[PDB]
Every structure is written in C-alpha cells, then in structure tokens.
Short mmCIF file of C-alpha atoms in Angstrom, two decimals:
data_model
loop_
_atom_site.label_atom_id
_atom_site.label_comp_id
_atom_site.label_asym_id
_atom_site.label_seq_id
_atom_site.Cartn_x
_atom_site.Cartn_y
_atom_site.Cartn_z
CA UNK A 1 -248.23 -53.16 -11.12
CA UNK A 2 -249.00 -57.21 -11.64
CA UNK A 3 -251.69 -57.98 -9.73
CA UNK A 4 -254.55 -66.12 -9.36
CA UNK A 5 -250.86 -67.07 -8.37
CA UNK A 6 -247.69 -64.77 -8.44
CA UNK A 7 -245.67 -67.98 -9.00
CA UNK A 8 -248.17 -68.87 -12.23
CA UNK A 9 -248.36 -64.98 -13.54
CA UNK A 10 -244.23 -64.61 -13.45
CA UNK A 11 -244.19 -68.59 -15.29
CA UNK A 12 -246.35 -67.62 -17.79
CA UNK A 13 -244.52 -63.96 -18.39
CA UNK A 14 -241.36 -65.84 -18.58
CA UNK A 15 -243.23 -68.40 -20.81
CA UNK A 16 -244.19 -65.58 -22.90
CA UNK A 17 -240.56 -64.21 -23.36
CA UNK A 18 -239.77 -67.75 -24.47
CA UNK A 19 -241.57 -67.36 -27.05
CA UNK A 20 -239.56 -64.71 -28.78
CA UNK A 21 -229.82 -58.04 -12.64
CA UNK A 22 -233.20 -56.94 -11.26
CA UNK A 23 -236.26 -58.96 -9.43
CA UNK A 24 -238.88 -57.45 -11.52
CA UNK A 25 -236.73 -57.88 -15.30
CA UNK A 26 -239.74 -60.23 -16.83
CA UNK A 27 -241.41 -57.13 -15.87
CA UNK A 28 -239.44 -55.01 -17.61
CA UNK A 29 -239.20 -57.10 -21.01
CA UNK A 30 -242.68 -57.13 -20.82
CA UNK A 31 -242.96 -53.67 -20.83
CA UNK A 32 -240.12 -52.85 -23.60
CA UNK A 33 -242.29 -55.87 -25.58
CA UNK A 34 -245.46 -54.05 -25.28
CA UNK A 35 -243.82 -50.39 -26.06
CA UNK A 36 -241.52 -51.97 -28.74
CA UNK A 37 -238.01 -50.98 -27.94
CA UNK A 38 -236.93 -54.99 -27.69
CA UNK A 39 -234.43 -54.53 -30.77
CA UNK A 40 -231.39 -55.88 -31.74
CA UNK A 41 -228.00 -53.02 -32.16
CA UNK A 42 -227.83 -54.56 -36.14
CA UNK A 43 -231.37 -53.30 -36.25
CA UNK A 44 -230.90 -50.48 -34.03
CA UNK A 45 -228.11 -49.24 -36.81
CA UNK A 46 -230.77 -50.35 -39.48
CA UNK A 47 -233.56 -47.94 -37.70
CA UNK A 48 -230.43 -45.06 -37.87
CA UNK A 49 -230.04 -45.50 -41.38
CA UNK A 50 -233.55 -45.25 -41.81
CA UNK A 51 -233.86 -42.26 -39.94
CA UNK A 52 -231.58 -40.48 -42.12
CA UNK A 53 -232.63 -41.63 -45.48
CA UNK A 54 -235.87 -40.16 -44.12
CA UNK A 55 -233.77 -36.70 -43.37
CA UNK A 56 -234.70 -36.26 -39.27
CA UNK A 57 -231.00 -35.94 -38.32
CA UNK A 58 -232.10 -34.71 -34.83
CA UNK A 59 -234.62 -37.69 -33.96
CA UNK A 60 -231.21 -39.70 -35.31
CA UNK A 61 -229.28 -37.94 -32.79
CA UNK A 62 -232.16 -37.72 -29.84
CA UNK A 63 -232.60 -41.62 -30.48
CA UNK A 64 -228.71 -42.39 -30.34
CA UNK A 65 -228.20 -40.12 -27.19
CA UNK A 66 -231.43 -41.50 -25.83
CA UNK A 67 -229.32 -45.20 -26.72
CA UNK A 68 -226.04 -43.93 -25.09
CA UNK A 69 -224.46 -43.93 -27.99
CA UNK A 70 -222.60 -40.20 -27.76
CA UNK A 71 -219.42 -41.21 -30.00
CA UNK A 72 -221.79 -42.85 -33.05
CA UNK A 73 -224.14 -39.77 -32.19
CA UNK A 74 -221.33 -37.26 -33.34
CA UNK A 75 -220.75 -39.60 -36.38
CA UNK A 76 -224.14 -39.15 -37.44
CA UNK A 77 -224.57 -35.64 -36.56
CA UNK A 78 -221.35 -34.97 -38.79
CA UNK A 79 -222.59 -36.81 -41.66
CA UNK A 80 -225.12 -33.91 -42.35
CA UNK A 81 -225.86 -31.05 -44.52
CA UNK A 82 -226.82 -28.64 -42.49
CA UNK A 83 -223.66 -26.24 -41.18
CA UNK A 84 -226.27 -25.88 -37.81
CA UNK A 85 -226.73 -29.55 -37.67
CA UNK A 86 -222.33 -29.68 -37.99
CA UNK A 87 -221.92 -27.17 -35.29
CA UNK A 88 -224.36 -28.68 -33.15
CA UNK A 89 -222.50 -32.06 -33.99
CA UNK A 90 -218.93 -30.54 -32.86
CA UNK A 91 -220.44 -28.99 -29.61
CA UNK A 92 -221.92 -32.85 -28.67
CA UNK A 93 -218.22 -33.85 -29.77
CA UNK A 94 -216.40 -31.94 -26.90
CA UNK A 95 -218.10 -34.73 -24.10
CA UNK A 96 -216.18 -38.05 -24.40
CA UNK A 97 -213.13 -36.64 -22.98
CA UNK A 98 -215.31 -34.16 -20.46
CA UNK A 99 -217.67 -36.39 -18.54
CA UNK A 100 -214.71 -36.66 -16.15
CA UNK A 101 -215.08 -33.27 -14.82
CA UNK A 102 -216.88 -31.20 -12.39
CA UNK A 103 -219.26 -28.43 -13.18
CA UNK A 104 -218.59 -24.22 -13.89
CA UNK A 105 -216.08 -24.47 -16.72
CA UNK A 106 -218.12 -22.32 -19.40
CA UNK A 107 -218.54 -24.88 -21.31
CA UNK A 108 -221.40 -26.80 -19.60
CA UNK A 109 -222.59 -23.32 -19.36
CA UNK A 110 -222.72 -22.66 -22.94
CA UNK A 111 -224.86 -26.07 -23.10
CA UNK A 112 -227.46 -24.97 -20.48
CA UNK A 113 -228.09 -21.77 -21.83
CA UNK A 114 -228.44 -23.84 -25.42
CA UNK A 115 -230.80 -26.04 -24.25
CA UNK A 116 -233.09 -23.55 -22.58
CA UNK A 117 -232.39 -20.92 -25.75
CA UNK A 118 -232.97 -23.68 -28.71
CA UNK A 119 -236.18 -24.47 -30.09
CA UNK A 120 -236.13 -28.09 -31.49
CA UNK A 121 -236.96 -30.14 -28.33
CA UNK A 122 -234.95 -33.03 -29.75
CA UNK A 123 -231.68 -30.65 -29.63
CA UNK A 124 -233.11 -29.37 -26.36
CA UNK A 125 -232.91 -32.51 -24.75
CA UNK A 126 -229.39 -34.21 -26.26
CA UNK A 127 -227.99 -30.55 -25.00
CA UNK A 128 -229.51 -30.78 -21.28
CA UNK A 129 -228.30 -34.27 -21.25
CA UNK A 130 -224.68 -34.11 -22.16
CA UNK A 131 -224.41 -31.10 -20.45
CA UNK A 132 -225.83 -32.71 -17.25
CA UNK A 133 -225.73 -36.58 -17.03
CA UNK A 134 -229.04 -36.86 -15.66
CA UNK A 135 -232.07 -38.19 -16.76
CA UNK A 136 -234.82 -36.21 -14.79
CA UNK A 137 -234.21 -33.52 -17.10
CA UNK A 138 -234.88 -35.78 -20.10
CA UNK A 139 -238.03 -37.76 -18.74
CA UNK A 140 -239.98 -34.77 -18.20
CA UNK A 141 -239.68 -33.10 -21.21
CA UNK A 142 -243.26 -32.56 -22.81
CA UNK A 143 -242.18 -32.07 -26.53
CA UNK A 144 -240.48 -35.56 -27.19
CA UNK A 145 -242.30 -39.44 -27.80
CA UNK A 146 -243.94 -40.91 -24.72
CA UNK A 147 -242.96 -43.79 -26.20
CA UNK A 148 -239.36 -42.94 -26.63
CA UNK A 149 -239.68 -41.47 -22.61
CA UNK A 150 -240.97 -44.89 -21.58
CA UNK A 151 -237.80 -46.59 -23.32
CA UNK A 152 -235.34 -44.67 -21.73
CA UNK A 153 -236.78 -44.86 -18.06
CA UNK A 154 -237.40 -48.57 -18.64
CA UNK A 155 -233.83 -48.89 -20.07
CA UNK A 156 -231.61 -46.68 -17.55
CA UNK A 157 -233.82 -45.81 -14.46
CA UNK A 158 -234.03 -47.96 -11.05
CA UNK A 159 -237.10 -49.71 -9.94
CA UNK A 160 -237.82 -46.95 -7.38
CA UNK A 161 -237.49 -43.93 -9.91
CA UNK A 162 -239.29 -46.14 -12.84
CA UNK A 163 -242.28 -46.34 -9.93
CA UNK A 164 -242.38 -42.96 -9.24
CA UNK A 165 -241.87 -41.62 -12.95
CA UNK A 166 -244.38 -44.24 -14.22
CA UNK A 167 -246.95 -42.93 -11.31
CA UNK A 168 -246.41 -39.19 -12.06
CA UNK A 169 -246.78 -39.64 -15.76
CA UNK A 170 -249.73 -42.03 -15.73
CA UNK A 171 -251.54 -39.84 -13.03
CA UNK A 172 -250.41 -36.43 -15.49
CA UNK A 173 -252.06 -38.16 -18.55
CA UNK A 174 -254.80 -39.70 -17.19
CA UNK A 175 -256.45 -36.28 -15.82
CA UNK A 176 -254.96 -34.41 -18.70
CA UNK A 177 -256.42 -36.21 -21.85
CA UNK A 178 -253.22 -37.58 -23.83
CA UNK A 179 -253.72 -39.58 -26.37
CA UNK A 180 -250.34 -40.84 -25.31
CA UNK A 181 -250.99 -41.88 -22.38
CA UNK A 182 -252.62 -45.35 -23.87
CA UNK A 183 -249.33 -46.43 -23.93
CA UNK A 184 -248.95 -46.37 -20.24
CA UNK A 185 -252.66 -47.37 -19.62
CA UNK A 186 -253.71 -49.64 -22.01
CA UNK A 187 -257.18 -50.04 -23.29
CA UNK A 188 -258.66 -50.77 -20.21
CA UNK A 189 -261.37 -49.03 -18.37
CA UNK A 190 -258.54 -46.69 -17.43
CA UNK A 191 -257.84 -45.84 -21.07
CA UNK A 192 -261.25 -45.46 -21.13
CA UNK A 193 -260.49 -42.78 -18.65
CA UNK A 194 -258.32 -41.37 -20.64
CA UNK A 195 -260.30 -41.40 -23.99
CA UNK A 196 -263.25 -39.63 -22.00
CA UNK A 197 -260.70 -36.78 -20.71
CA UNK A 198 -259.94 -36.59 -24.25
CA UNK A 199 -263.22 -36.15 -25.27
CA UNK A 200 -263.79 -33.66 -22.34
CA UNK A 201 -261.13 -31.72 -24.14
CA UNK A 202 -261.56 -31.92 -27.60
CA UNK A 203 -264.96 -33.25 -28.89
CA UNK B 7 -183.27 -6.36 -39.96
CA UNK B 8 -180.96 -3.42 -38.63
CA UNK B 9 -179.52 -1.82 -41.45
CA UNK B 10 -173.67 4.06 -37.67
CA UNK B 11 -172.70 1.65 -35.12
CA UNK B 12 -175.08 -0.97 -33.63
CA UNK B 13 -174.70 0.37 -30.17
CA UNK B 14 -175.64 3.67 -31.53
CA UNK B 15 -179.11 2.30 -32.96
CA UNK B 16 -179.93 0.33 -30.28
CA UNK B 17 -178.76 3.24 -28.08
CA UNK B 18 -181.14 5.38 -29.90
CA UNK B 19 -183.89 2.76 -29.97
CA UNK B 20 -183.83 2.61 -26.24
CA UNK B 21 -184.36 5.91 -25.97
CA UNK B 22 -187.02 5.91 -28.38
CA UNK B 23 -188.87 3.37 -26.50
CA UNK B 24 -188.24 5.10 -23.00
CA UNK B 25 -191.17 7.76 -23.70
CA UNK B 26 -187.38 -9.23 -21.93
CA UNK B 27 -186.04 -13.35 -22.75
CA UNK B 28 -184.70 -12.30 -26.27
CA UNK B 29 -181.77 -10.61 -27.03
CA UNK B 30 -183.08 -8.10 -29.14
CA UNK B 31 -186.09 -7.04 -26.96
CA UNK B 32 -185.61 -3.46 -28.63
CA UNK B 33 -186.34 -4.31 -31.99
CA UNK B 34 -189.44 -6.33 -30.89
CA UNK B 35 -190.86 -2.94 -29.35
CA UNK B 36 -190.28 -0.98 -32.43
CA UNK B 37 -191.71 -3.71 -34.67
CA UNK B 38 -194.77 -3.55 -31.93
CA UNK B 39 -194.42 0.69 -32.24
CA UNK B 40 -194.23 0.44 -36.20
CA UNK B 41 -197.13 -2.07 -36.60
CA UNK B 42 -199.22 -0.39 -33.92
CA UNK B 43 -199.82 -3.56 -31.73
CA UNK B 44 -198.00 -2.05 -28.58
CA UNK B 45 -201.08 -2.87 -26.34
CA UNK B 46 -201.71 -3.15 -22.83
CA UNK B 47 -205.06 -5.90 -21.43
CA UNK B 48 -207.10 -1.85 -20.97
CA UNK B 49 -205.99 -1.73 -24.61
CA UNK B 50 -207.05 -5.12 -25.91
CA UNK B 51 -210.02 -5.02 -23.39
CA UNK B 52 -211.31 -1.55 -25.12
CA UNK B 53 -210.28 -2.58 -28.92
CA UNK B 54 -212.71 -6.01 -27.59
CA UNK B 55 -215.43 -3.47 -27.35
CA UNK B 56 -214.95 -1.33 -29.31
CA UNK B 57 -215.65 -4.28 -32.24
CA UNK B 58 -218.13 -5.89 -30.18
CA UNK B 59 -220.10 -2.27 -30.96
CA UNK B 60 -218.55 -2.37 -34.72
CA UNK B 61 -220.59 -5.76 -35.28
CA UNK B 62 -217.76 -8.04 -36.33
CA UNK B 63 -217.87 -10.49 -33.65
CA UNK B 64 -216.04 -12.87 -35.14
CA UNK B 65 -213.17 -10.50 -35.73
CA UNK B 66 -213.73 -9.67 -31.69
CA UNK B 67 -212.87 -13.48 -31.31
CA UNK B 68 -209.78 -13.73 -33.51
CA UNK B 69 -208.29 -10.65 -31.91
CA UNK B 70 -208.89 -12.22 -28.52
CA UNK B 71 -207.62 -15.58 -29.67
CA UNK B 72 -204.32 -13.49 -31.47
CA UNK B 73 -203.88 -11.74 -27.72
CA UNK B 74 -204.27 -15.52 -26.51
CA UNK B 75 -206.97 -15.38 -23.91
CA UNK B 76 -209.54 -18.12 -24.97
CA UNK B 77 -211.79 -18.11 -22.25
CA UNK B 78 -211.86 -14.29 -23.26
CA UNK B 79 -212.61 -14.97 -26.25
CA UNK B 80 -215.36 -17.07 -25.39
CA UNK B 81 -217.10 -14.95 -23.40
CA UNK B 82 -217.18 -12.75 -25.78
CA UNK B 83 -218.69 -14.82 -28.50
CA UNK B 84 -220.98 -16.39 -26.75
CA UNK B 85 -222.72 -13.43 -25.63
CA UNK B 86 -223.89 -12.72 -28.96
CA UNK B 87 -227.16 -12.61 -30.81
CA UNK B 88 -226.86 -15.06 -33.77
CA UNK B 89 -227.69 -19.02 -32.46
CA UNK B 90 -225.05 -19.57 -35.23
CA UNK B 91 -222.64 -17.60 -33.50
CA UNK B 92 -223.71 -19.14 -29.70
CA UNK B 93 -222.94 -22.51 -31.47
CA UNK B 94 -219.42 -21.72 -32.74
CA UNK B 95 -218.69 -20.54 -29.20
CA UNK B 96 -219.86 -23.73 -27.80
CA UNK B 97 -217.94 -25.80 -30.03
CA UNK B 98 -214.39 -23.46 -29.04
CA UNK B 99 -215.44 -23.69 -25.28
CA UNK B 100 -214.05 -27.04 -25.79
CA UNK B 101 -210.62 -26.60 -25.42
CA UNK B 102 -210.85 -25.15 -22.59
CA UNK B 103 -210.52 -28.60 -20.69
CA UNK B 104 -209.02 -30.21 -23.89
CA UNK B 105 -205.63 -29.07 -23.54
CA UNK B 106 -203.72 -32.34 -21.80
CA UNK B 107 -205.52 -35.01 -24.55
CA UNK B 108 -202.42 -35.37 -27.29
CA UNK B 109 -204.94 -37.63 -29.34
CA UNK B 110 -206.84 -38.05 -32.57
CA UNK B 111 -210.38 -38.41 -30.64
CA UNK B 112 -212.92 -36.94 -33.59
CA UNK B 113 -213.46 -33.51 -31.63
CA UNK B 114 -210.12 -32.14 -33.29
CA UNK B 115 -211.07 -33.87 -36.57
CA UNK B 116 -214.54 -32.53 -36.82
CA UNK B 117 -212.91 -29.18 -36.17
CA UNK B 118 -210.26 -29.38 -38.94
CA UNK B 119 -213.14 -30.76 -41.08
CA UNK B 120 -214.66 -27.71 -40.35
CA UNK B 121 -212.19 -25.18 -40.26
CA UNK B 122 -211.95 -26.21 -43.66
CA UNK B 123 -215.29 -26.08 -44.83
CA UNK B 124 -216.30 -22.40 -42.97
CA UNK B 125 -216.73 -19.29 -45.02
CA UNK B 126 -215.50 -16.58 -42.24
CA UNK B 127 -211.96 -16.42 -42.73
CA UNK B 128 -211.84 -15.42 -38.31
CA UNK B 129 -213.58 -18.51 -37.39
CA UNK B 130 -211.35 -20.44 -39.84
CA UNK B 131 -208.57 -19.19 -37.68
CA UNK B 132 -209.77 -19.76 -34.78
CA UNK B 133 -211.14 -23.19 -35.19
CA UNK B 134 -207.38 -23.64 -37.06
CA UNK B 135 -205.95 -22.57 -33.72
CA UNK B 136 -208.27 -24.26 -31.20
CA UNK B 137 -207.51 -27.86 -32.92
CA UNK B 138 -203.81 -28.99 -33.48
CA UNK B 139 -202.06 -26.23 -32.08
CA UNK B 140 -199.60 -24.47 -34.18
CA UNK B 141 -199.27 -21.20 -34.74
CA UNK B 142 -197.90 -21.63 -38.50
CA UNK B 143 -201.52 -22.77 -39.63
CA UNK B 144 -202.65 -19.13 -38.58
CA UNK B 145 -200.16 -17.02 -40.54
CA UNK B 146 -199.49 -18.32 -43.38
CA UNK B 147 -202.89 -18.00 -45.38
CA UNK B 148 -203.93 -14.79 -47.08
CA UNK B 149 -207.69 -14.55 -45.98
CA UNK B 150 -206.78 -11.90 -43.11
CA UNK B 151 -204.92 -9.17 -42.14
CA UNK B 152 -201.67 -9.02 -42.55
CA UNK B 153 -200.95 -6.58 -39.55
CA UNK B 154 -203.20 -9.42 -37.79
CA UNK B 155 -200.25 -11.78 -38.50
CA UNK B 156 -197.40 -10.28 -37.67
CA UNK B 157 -199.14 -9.21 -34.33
CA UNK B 158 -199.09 -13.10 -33.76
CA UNK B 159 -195.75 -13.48 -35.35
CA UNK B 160 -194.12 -10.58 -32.56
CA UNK B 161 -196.59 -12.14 -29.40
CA UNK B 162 -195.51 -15.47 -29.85
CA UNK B 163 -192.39 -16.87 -31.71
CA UNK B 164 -189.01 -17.39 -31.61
CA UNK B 165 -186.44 -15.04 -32.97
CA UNK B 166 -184.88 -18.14 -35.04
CA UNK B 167 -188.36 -18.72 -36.84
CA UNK B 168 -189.51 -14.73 -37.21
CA UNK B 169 -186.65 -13.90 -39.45
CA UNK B 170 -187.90 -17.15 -41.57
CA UNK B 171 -191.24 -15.85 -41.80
CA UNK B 172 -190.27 -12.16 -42.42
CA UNK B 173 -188.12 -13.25 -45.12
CA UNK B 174 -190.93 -15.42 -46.48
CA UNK B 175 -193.71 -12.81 -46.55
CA UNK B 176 -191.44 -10.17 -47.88
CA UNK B 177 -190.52 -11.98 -51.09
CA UNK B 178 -194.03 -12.88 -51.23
CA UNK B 179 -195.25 -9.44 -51.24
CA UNK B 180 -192.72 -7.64 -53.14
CA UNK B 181 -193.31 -9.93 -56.69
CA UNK B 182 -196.99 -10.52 -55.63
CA UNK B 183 -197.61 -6.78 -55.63
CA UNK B 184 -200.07 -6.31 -52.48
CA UNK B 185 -200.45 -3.26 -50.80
CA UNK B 186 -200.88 -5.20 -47.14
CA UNK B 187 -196.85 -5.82 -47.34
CA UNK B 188 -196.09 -1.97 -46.64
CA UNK B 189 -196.30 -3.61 -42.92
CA UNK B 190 -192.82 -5.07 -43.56
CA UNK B 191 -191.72 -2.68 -46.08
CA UNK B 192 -192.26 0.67 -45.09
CA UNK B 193 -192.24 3.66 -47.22
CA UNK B 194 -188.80 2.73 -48.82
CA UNK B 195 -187.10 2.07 -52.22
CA UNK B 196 -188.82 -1.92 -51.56
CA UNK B 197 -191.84 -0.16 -50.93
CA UNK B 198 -191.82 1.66 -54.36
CA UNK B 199 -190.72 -1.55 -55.76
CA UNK B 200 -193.68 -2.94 -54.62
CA UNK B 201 -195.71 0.25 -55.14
CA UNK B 202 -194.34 -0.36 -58.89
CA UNK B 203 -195.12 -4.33 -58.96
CA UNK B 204 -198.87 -3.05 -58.04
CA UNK B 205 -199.35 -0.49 -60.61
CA UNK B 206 -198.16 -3.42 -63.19
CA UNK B 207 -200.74 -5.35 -61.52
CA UNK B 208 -203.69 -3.18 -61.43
CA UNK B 209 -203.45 0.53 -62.66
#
C-alpha cells in the first residue's frame, strides 16, 4: 500500500535493495525480502536437496511446481520410494508435451477428479494446477503455507490480481484470527488486530 | 499350419465358419474358433463387465488394451475404487494425446522404469504397451496367459511374423513342459509329447 515524499520512500526502497518490467517492482522485492523467497536457483536446488534429505517429497514437488519447474518436478518425484509418490510422478510427467491442448480429453479429467479425491493438499494443489494452468485455484487453497501463497502471487500474478488477492486474504485473516496472517500484516496495530481475533478464538 | 487337397480343407473350413486383407482369412477364424477369442464389441463389452464384477480390474484393462481400445480401457480403470488404481489410470490416460511425439521426453522413460519395477503382471503389459509401442514386448514374457497372447498375436500381426512366433512358442512349450501350450497343440501326439515332458517335470 506505501503510503513524507513518494520520490524519497521509492529512493530509499531502492537504497535498501542496494544493499543486498513493472512500476511497482521495488515494491515487489520488498515484499519477496520481507517474506523471504529472494533466493538464488543454486540455492533454490540446495533448498530441494534439503527437502528430500528431510523426506517431504510432496512439499519438494508443491515447491518446484509452485517454482515452474514441472520437468525437474518429475525428476524429483521419480527419485522416490514410494510406488504412490512414482505414480503420482508419471501422471505430472504426461504435461510437457500436453499444455498445448484444449480441455475434455480424459486425461485432464482424471486430474480434476484427483485433486478433489486426494487428501494431501500439497498433491491437491500440483494436480489442480497442471491439470488447469491457473493460479486462482492454487492461491486459495487453505491447507498450504501463506507464506509459500504470498510467493507465488508475488512471483506470477499481475498488479491488479496481487491487489485484489492481497485484499481478500488480508481482510479473510484479519477477521478470522490466523496466526498467518502476520505475514501479510505485520506487527502493527493491525497485527494487533489480528493477535486479538486470535485471542477471541483461542485463549 | 494345414496339415486331402487344400481346396478341400479350406472348402470345408468355409463351411465350418459359415454357421479379410490376408490370404488365409480362414485359418485366422478357426485359430479365433479354436482359441475362443471370436468376439464381437457386445462380446468384449460384456466379458469388460463381467471382470469388472469378478474384481480383477487390472485384468479388465489388459483385455481392453489386447482388444485395442485405450480410451476404453481407461474408463474402465479409472472408475475404480483403489487411489492406486485411479493413479495407474491417470498415468495411461497419457497416451491418449501422446501418440504423434516419436521422442525420448522422460514420460515414456518413467513408464519403462516402471513397467519394470510393477508387481501386476496386467499393468506391466499395459504400461509395456502404452510406452514404445511394439507389440513383441507384450507376448513374449511368461507372466500371463497364454490364450491372452495369441489373442494379440491373431488381432494384430502379420502372417510373415505369426508363423515366427507360433514356431517359437511351440518349441518353447513342448521341451519346457507347460500345460498353457495345449493352445497351439491341441489334443494330439505333440500334445502327449508335451503331456509326457510335464509328467517328467512334475508327477
């Protein structure tokens, strides 16, 4: 949102970028400083590899489709031990050559009724997006990161839909109570806001 | 094979068969009569339900991939109960649209991969089938039926290359001593040969 000078807030945001396409992009590195998604690919492929030495092959997978990485999400995916996780990996492998297609040939079918049958919301969400390249379907799913929702809308989305998702989900959390909402909010007296809805809620 | 006259036995064939693209049409019915695959669609349509009742929907999948309707056979794993299953039907929906694509591009390698490392001999098959398309990868290993394979050895082959296989599985069978190769050898002096070879086999 911004809001003594416009001239002498964007300087010192640039300034601030110095330090370590669009009209509003210091805006935007802001934000992907503050929600720490401003990584390098090396280090990207360094976070992978810690992902699955830690053994969540799906949050591997959700964070390389959330990337746009589809090919080097069906190389991890395959590298598993799981037959589940391998089948899953060979149904995300038919969609390099099939993005190039309209809709209604069974097989984005198949993927719909997948992603409204399955019950991990990481596979829930890689299946609703490569079925359907979208991302309204993935930014409004209530069972993944906040943080990881704020990435990919700050990453992919225009300004207009990043307004209107950021105002949705900042009005959703700030009357509902989530914790995870601070990210979005801040401490500020709005997070104090939030922490009092919370309290409201929980005790 | 054939064997008073060979207008007289394809005379009488005919008119055994009254009750093409080859030149011995004839002997392809009787080998369709003899190994009980003569089948029209309300056929293979009722044998698809009547082993979608059995259980064995994976065999319901290989029969409808051996009749060679894949979007039939599809269907009809997909609407299963098993996620397992619903996944393996995903991953075949593939080919549906990946029929043009000559090309290593992962999806057929993850699919050989595992076509090789499956248990269920059907899905082995059919994953077999679905990537690098050959019919010769289908009927040549022992892990099903061996009425199953010659049903896809009279559908769809050449003359030239059907004698080659016959001859093939026959002198496997005979000095292997299996049972399944009274398909090619009837109830016949080779049959008690091979009647005899499984006696010294197995008492």
């Amino acid at each position: 949102n911004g809001i003594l000078s416009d001239k002498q807030l964007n300087k010192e945001m640039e300034k601030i970028i110095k330090l370590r396409g669009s009209p509003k992009y210091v805006q935007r590195r802001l934000c992907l400083i503050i929600s720490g998604w401003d990584l390098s690919r090396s280090d990207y492929e360094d976070k992978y590899n810690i992902i699955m030495k830690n053994g969540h092959y799906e949050k591997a997978a959700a964070w390389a489709v959330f990337f746009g990485d589809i090919p080097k999400a069906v190389e991890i995916l395959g590298s598993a031990k799981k037959e589940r996780l391998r089948l899953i990996a060979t149904a995300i492998a038919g969609y390099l050559a099939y993005k190039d297609l309209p809709g209604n040939n069974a097989w984005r079918q198949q993927c719909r009724k997948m992603s409204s049958e399955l019950d991990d919301p990481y596979l829930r969400v890689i299946f609703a997006f490569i079925a359907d390249n979208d991302w309204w379907d993935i930014l409004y799913e209530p069972a993944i990161s906040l943080r990881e929702r704020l990435g990919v809308a700050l990453r992919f989305l225009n300004d207009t839909d990043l307004t209107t998702f950021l105002d949705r989900t900042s009005s959703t959390v700030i009357e509902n109570g989530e914790l995870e909402g601070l990210i979005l909010t801040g401490i500020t007296p709005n997070g104090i806001d939030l922490l009092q809805s919370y309290v409201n809620k929980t005790s | 094979n054939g064997i008073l006259s060979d207008k007289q036995l394809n005379k009488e064939m005919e008119k055994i068969i009254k009750l093409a693209g080859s030149p011995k049409y004839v002997q392809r019915r009787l080998c369709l009569i003899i190994s009980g695959w003569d089948l029209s669609r309300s056929d293979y349509e009722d044998k698809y339900n009547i082993i979608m009742k059995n259980g064995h929907y994976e065999k319901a999948a290989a029969w409808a991939v051996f009749f060679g309707d894949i979007p039939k056979a599809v269907e009809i794993l997909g609407s299963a109960k098993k996620e397992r299953l619903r996944l393996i039907a995903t991953a075949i929906a593939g080919y549906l649209a990946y029929k043009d694509l000559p090309g290593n591009n992962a999806w057929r390698q993850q699919c050989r991969k595992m076509s090789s490392e499956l248990d269920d001999p059907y899905l082995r098959v059919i994953f077999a089938f679905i990537a690098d398309n050959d019919w010769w990868d289908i009927l040549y290993e022992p892990a099903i039926s061996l009425r199953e394979r010659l049903g896809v050895a009279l559908r769809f082959l050449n003359d030239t290359d059907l004698t080659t296989f016959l001859d093939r599985t026959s002198s496997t069978v005979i000095e292997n001593g299996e049972l399944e190769g009274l398909i090619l050898t009837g109830i016949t002096p080779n049959g008690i040969d091979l009647l005899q070879s499984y006696v010294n086999k197995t008492s």
